[PDB]
Symmetry: C3
């Protein structure tokens, strides 16, 4: 809708509100097939140049099949990482079924007459099939009358050119699979062309507005998809495409921006610092909040946030209280402490946080007008209305030029409520109460003395 933003001067943080959710919760598994020819590399006596080229491209086909055969032996399972298990388990389950006797025949037969079908496998999963390239019919009808005789028939050059074209796709598929150990992501247009992907989106048992969502964001849908190599058996090459399912849609999302907040004394080493933790994306999800701590797991498209729940934490909705009253007791807001007063900026959705310390030169400029604000020591913020760049020391940053309203929530920097002599100044993952507890402990060790 209408993007908005709040900067909290008291904690050197900012929240961008107004975004709408799209969280991956499930997976559609589709089977993609290429019908192959069982040729025997039949050789006949021929030195005709058009015969050589047909043999040369038939060898590239033979090798492609044989490399895919040595690659399906080695169980494709290297799309797992970071303790979350395998993203691909849904599809690896389908590959296991395909290796069952008569299951390839079952797709062979549904794809006897048509390109699309809905096959139910003997494990109860109703997969969408698709034949995307027919090399069995091509090689068997155009190329065997050419090599299956005592002396070779001579082909026309259009056949030579059309075979190179048709075989190309099989080769690029093999190429990708052999440098990725059977699993790819993103899913390339060789794995699945824009037309085939859009048909597959159109053909799924899902709601029309969610078909619209995927069609309008196909690049993001690709980036969140996998292609898994299954099996080459009985004149069929089969691989599984795993497409994202968005079980959470149109819940509010917001992004937390954080920057270090220090004191501004003139003596170096007399200064204390604190910074809010768990910067990142927060989406309302099923009564709680899904939190996405890694910067890259969320792709943003206008006002929609596409995230994978696989690398997220689930928090109580009280976590939002850290943005309105960082001292409330409902939620133990987490902070980091240091004495590292080094200047820096964070480009937010509608502006920029600037943490300026020491002798660093900190400004915000307009392209035509030059400098229009100078930041003082401390943590400060500027809206993107009328600003194009911000500079901190020798680095220049470009402010985002999105339309929206910022709100500067004034407040005392909470670093000023702390006595520097009893401040726990090297805390890596503490909390507001956990710092007040060590202060109250260290106020007792000075109480007796």
């Amino acid at each position: 809708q209408n993007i908005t933003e709040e900067f909290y001067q008291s904690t050197c943080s900012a929240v961008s509100k107004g975004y709408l959710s799209a969280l991956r919760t499930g997976w559609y598994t589709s089977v993609i097939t290429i019908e192959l020819s069982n040729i025997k590399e039949n050789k006949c006596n021929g030195t005709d140049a058009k015969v050589k080229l047909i043999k040369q491209e038939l060898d590239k086909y033979k090798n492609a099949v044989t490399e895919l055969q040595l690659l399906m032996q080695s169980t494709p399972a290297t799309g797992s990482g970071s303790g979350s298990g395998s993203a691909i388990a849904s599809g690896v389950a389908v590959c296991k079924v395909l290796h069952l006797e008569g299951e390839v025949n079952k797709i062979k037969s549904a794809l006897l007459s048509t390109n699309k079908c809905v096959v139910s496998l003997s494990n109860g999963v109703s997969v969408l099939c698709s034949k995307v390239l027919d090399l069995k019919n091509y090689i068997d009808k155009q190329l065997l009358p050419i090599v299956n005789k005592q002396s070779c028939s001579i082909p026309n050059i259009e056949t030579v050119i059309e075979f190179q074209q048709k075989n190309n796709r099989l080769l690029e598929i093999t190429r990708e699979f052999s440098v990725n150990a059977g699993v790819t992501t993103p899913v390339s247009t060789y794995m699945l062309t824009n037309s085939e992907l859009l048909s597959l989106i159109n053909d799924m048992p899902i709601t029309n507005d969610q078909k619209k969502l995927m069609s309008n964001n196909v690049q993001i849908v690709r980036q969140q998809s996998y292609s898994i190599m299954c099996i080459i058996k009985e004149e069929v090459l089969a691989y599984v495409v795993q497409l994202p399912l968005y079980g959470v849609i149109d819940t509010p999302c917001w992004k937390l921006h954080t920057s270090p907040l220090c004191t501004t004394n003139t003596k170096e080493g007399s200064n204390i610092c604190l910074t809010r933790t768990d910067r990142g994306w927060y989406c309302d999800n099923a009564g709680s909040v899904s939190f996405f701590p890694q910067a890259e797991t969320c792709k943003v498209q206008s006002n929609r946030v596409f995230c994978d729940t696989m690398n997220s934490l689930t928090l109580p909705s009280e976590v939002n209280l850290c943005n309105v009253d960082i001292f409330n007791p409902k939620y133990d807001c987490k902070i980091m402490t240091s004495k590292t007063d080094v200047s820096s900026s964070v480009i937010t959705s509608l502006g920029a946080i600037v943490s300026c310390y020491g002798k660093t030169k900190c400004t915000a400029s307009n392209k035509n007008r030059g400098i229009i604000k100078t930041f003082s020591n401390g943590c400060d913020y500027v809206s993107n209305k009328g600003v194009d760049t911000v500079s901190v020391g020798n680095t220049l940053y470009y402010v985002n030029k999105q339309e929206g309203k910022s709100l500067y929530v004034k407040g005392e920097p909470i670093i000023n409520f702390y006595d520097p002599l009893v401040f726990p100044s090297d805390e890596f993952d503490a909390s507001i109460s956990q710092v007040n507890e060590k202060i109250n402990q260290s106020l007792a060790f000075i109480r007796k003395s």
Copy 2:
């Protein structure tokens, strides 16, 4: 062999045993050559369409050579990172030799009659050579009678098509090298086709079962290899392929899984936490243990672990005592402390650790039966026998479906042996004794008072 797994309730950790080692310790360097033609871009008067296409593809060849010439000037050396020095130094050493006078002639001459050879260079390294594409013979015999006259001879269309085909590989090689600054990894099938790689594996002075190991895991062999650009000199393009050498084979490996272990009091902020560090892969290696702390440096293929020793630490074998008696004195087991009681799961090899805290909903489900276990606050574990998924808050995880035996080692959670008032609750990289030492120090500051 038979994968097994032990979960230690007392420390919220688990070990997967049964894997077999394959650690990269060395490098084979092979020289890959493409013989080139020194054509002068000879132009003759011709507007015949088949002449244009031959000129168009000869310009793409000329430029390819000239870009590779400007790229070999800039010393290919950007495959170094993280303080470990250069992975590629073995091959960069061979490139330096190749620039010596008469060393290209020496390979020119061994490859006068055959495609394979074993050349000894003037530095005593016995490299495997290989001519993979002959453009000198092709261009000099099919294309100069076509452009080296007053008026051009006209070529047949098969020549046009065959030249595009043969020249393609040179172009994709140039493409790769110019976006990677002379070093690539993985090694693409353009750098080295599956056939050429399998021949090169077959042709090395190594033991037959280790030839088998590499042939059966070519995708992993590629991912651990480099291609380095050397030199274009005297009608030869030469680049070096560095293949992995597995100096450690068939020693036991095991993977440590760790998850946070906290108290389960009902009051928020009254809870302490600890977590074991150095999760990852451990392989027995030459009387010690090679430890691989980064998740991605180890590719797993069935029960074999392929790791690069370049990013590993070497530990005493006593490090395994942390999995059997975390309090023993032989080895100072390392732990992290916090008050971050946030729920999470770790998908292990044969099961799942679940650290459930607060109000988080934590279950394990079977596809057909639905929920079949509910986790309580604390750290717990479930085997993959009869379970397909585990859910923690809004995230769903897929359990691995490998065959093996799990063993639930019951025990008191060691977090319960600690007095929360004297607990060092924000320790980033501590150790069991190092925490007991600060407890014993803080038991003295309360002893006088």
Copy 3:
């Protein structure tokens, strides 16, 4: 010039001096155009094989245009990350202008007669234009007399082959843009060939020695560039290439190497450790020092360092005092403390730091001579003169073979100036004075008692 290196025994660190700077501060934006044909996929009755191939390649063209049309709707803006805002804002600004009425016509018209031009847009930016592929003229003059009639004219096979060739580039461009959501980096040779890039470098309003710098490091220039998709409107495909501008040139750069420094007592757990922080690249920049903490943001070419200022911190030049007198007061040198005495090495520019502890076996070897140094417990260093490898436990490292002079600055390891009983042994981001302050605090808690 002459690379040099200093190892500081007192702090287990080393500095490599002698490098020359090249820091990205700005951006050149160029507009790259491909003139397109507005064909209507005109179908006529034809089953001639050469007609099929022309239709097949015209469909691949139609789809390419239509996918690029659905991709330009979704605002290309996923080259932003890590709080630094968008690297691409300079170019996204040009895309916004191009969507203005009559701005595509303005480039259409400057490129009516020539391939190069300098167009001033209605926002005052003087961009370099370029027409790199003309498919409007090709399709309109060779292919419409072929499909714009009642029955199709038959084309020659050279036309079929030339169209495949010319259309290829458009297809690979679409391929790249659709798996990258409209932004690519590095800039591929499909986005911009070496010839086109070198012309664009030659054609910019910049100084001749800086043209030389870019021409001689084109691979690095690519790696630091972006390609952004703009707009398909009025028979023009336009995308923006953003090339690096080096606002800082030929200032001194140096790289800091750091390794843990511990005590060498024989009892495990009685040992304290400290390590200098902020290892990395330091370049003099405009009276301060630009510091590059991430290892990969700086590409090194002989003695030149190419860095992006976007991910850098700006420090006072007094930060160099940490390498000459780590205790000076001008700058609060930052250190990390632990009890993690685990052995390791750092390969420097002209040598190797070795931190050897426990029972670890630590040597430096020469290829022909074998072991030539054995390291003792502590932190030590060896020059690359006469050494080829260094081994720490089970890992082998290759020393860099660059020419230069090392200097071993002897000195007492400063870890020895600390009383282990009052040492803050788990400090994550402390400083020299900040450790002396907690020592002086903990010397008072023992003073009363």
